[PDB]
Amino acid sequence: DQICIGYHANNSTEQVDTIMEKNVTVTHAQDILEKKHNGKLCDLDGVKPLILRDCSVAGWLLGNPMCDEFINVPEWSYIVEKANPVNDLCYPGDFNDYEELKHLLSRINHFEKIQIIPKSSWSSHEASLGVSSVCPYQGKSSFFRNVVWLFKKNSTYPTIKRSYNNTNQEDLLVLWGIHHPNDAAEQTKLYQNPTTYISVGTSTLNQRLVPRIATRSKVNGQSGRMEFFWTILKPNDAINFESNGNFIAPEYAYKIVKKGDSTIMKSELEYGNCNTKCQTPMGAINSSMPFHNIHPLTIGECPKYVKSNRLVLATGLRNSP
Amino acid sequence: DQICIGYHANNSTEQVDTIMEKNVTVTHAQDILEKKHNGKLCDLDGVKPLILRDCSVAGWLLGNPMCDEFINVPEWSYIVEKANPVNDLCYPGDFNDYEELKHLLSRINHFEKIQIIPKSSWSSHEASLGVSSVCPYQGKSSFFRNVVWLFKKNSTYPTIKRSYNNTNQEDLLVLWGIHHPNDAAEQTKLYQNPTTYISVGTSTLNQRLVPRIATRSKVNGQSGRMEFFWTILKPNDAINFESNGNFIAPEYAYKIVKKGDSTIMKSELEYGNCNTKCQTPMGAINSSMPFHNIHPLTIGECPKYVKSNRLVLATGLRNSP
Amino acid sequence: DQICIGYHANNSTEQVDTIMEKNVTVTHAQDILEKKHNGKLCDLDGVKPLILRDCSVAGWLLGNPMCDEFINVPEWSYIVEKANPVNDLCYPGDFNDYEELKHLLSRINHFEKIQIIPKSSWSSHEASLGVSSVCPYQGKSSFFRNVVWLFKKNSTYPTIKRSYNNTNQEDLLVLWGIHHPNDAAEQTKLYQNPTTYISVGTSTLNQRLVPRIATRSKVNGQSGRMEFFWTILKPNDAINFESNGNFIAPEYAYKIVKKGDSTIMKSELEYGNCNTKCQTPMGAINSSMPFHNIHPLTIGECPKYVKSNRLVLATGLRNSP
Amino acid sequence: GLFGAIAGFIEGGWQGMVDGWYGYHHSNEQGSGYAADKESTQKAIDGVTNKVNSIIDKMNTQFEAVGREFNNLERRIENLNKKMEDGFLDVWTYNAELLVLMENERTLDFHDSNVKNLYDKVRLQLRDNAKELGNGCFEFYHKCDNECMESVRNGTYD
Amino acid sequence: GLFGAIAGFIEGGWQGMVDGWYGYHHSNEQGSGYAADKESTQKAIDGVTNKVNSIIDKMNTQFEAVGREFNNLERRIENLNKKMEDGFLDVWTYNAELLVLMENERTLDFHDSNVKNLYDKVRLQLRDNAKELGNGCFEFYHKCDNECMESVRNGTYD
Amino acid sequence: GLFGAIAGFIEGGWQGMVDGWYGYHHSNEQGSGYAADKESTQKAIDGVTNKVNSIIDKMNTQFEAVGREFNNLERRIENLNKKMEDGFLDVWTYNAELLVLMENERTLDFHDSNVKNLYDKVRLQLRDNAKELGNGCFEFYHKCDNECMESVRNGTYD
Ligand SMILES: *[C@@H]1O[C@H](CO)[C@@H](O)[C@H](O)[C@H]1NC(C)=O
Ligand SMILES: *[C@@H]1O[C@H](CO)[C@@H](O)[C@H](O)[C@H]1NC(C)=O
Ligand SMILES: *[C@@H]1O[C@H](CO)[C@@H](O)[C@H](O)[C@H]1NC(C)=O
């Protein structure tokens, strides 16, 4: 008559690592690392992302004629932009403090576009002629839709004194521009006046832009450059414009109605007609695991990213062969 | 006859956590996290902090007329500033590289103010008239105390060629300014000359400031703006000023006699008439614990900050019920 | 008759630390921290570093006449520069975005210097007279070797319109400069024209430099200042220069043929005629240990830096006395 | 195994004991079989479950990467930003991998300990009345019948 | 307990032993009482004291937050600075909390081990001459008198 | 020692056993000497070797400092860069030093455990046939001769 003490064995083939021993076979284990994603871009918690496609953030905000898909966009969860969007800055130039603006966009979920200065309001200057073959729309020469490229009228460009006050209760993103011609004759042709300036002011901003006339490489068939600036106009503050030429003027601005939780992710993927609670630039995660190894940049209710290929905890004991 | 092996139990109710078990009652434990502070701002190792109160660093350095409390301050341990000081920049404007200056202040414990250019030394320009209703002192119009707002004399503003050499053995903080008027008539009224500049130079600095005339929102009843600049004048170097208008000139500068260990903390608290060896923006710590959870920013002989609510080590054994 | 169980003791004096006990003597241990270096600067994997000696990066790129040792340098593994090189910027001034350039150098192993604009090509301006007593070479007045200090010819300085296109398949580093005189008479003497500019443009750059005339401290006997700029000219892009004075023009530029793994280390040490697989600014490491405590900044196949004085693992058991 | 029971003096586990982690095999004239020790098994289930939860939650406050962009002349701070984000990810990967390694070793030892203590509980009761075979088993001196077998597992014997 | 003594085969501790952490209860015709084992108690005091000190000092080189300010157009580096300061604080909080958790488990086990080794020291001497009850106690076969009791604690018996 | 064998009930090690980490001393009419237990010694060599390798490689993905320069008006980001590089170095120094401390404690315990299990293997076989002296030794009741001594080490006795 015998009584024996013993322990459970099973048909398990699950393995765990320890400091002293690798690949120990255990009766039970719990994998805690999520390795699968769905490879799509999805709605986040019901809310569709803003998928720019071929447009850049600059191309979207300024109103590149090829970016009409985004004339008025709904509330978004996150924004997706390609590494190298073709539709950006159709008339070549620079976008001043662009990355600081992009940063500010990561804390915004909704814009509402409002007209601050009507195209039909310019009396001493021409407003329908500021178009370019660099910015085509349907085969014809066009231009950024949210700003106005103003020219001289009847051989004169009187000094512009303009003013907007933010009636709205929301912060307002205001964009404007300056044209840097390639020669003195172009300056004459376009604006009449040889030496120009643009002065912009709010309660915080103290700005004067002077055009730079220089000869440069043709980008999209243009030797001119456009340089774009922005500011956030607080509530009940006013923005004062004064210019005598080279002025790319605001027609539209954006009211900010911002959820405040968002990101611009870089991805070549298109919309995947799916819903998820956790999105990466490579695909969405639906997991109950505490960790994942898909990609560092996620948004939503997400597992902790680690760089491991494998994370498995022992729960049971050393399985016997 | 029996002999037994056993272990100590007591009336202890102290609890410790382990990975496998929470709230294990132990006979003895050592709490290692300090959770208490005194809620006051105190002297550090005998040495009173500089409590700016309603003044900002800019308001203090420039000599805002409402900041007379700080005309000459003793050696300090740390500096305390409110989130939104009312007394800053009374005549509206900007303070160039302000945050870099604030950073440099964190490595300074004492300033000595010296006159570099006497108010009584301006011969071809008026010096007693540069005052403003924006900067009141005792109901009357006044101005920043360390700089001089110079006007034309007898309908003339001759070119200023000035020079200071640092005799002192200490680095010298020198502040100056420029006035940006709101219109051409104000430029005429104040300085006579229509187009102006200020050139500043040392062995390292190569500067020329051009005033920006623009129409802007009234801040404190002013549409003009002041823009302030600073530099550190090394020993035996000289600072050359040349201007024909819009010049806010240095009357005083600060000799640096710097302990080098300090910080600017943000707090709404007032002076607490206490002494301590460890100060946080919320209150002082007097503890023998290695860790604390009061606030990340401390100065002095201080425990290590952790974000824990509880850190208790077992010393004794599992107490029996 | 007895049988006993026991364990190994030896004459070992090696000690290990544990949480509960320090200096436990063990029969065997493995030291895992490398504490020795050779104190020299060595070739890395056969490849000699660029040891600037008394020259700075700026002094080397611009062609300071005292830096002829580096007129044409071979491929390098790393670069070594002194804390305070004497031979830098012989004619005093600033080097625009110098640290961003230095950063870009850390990802470069080879330059090839090519002539972009010949000294013998200036027709309406003098090219052999731009020399200075600040930049001596062999007792005589000289100047930066890679750029050309152009003066007026026969009392005239016609507008310069120049252009270079990058035929090469490699990115090209292009340097140019501007002279800031100390007075109007010097401006007259040197360039004839009272008000000047330099405009530089590629497909990305939109630049106009205006000289700043001001009185300043003599550095190396000069009150003038030189200000140097750079850009990377992409393949098949062109660089357009337009100036009417104060122009320090490129004679030479550098083709980039970049390994991409390198660093600028700061050291006072000279070349040590040695070879190594791991280099620090204090000396080279030849070790099989996983950790070292020599210096944070290393290059090559290197152990992990830790700030420990001692890292010793127990392998054997507690040695008996 | 630090405690010498699992794959030590008890050579291997039992496919026939599906009932729990640790238990008994008895053999006598009436027959033979397995019975799990529910108490130590449950003590083991709780310990391991809390461990997992503890592991999961201590790692719940971790570094989150935040998309951040820089222009062509901000290479230094871009690189700063790259080396910072990677630094923390490396720190946390290491923490995760090490905790798992260390705690896997502790879990295997924990089971080994539970088996040894269960062995000792049975040994301390049987005393003289059984030959300890040295394989996890006790051969009885006197006949033991199913109720006698309950008695040992019960903790009340003699 | 990994070692099976504390709240294992010895069901609970002694309120009556105020003298030290581990010791003995004796009972005979002359009476009964407690005596602490000063040597293993002191070995335990030293181990635990060094541990605390080790814990305290390994954490003495930690991250210190440094006030740092940024203007309205330096949001990216401000945020960089925020995520960096928080990153380290999280790393060190985790380190602190985990060390304490792991080392608390080791301290409880350490005590358990000291009790078991003390039990074994007494068992190895008594041998045949005492019935091992299975509760921490040894019932003597032969009468043992206070000097006989010293003898066991003394380590010199028979 | 948590397991009570090394510098516990076995007072000290053997200078005379050069052959391996753990083994036996025998003494009889034919003579006396040492014999290492190659199996548990090798099990110990493998465990310790893997440990070192594990320690080495978990630390192979560490923070590398990268030279980075700043002008006179970039003090804030320079300081940021300084406090970041130092932060990680401190984190990794701490990780390195702590792992070594914790794993040194585990290695000493591991050896202690191997000695105790080897002791128990011999005890479980000798049974009644030997007086357990309480010092690591078993005095035989009956004469044991060199082949009888092989038998114990062999694991096949009686
Ligand atoms: C902006 O317009 C509002 C609406 O009248 C006004 O109350 C506010 O004072 C204005 N702010 C200015 C003029 O700066
Ligand atoms: C500054 O003044 C001192 C005092 O004479 C003089 O030695 C030094 O050379 C001066 N530095 C200049 C003129 O830059
Ligand atoms: C640069 O020169 C090459 C060589 O002819 C030419 O193909 C290219 O178009 C030029 N780029 C310009 C003119 O910007």
Author numbering:
A (entry chain E), B (entry chain E), C (entry chain E): 5 to 325
D (entry chain F), E (entry chain F), F (entry chain F): 1 to 158
Q: What do the authors say?
A:
Thus to better understand the nature and significance of such adaptive changes, it is essential to monitor HA changes that may affect receptor specificity of avian influenza viruses, particularly during human infection. The effects of the single amino acid substitutions in the HA on receptor binding were also studied by X-ray crystallography of HAs in complex with pentasaccharides possessing terminal sialic acid (Sia) linked to galactose (Gal) by either α2-3 (LSTa) or α2-6 (LSTc) linkage.
Sialic acid was not detected in crystals of the Ile151Phe mutant HA soaked in either LSTa or LSTc receptor analogs. Comparison of the wild type and mutant HAs indicates that the side-chain of Phe151 projects into the receptor binding site about 2 Å further than Ile151. This may restrict receptor binding and consequently impair virus replication. The structure of the mutant HA shows that the larger Phe side chain projects further into the binding site such that it may restrict binding. The emergence of the Ile151Phe variant was observed between days 5 and 8 of illness in a patient who ultimately succumbed to infection with an oseltamivir-resistant virus. The 151Phe variant comprised 65% of the virus population on day 7, increasing to 100% in the clinical specimen from which the MDCK cell isolate was derived on day 8.
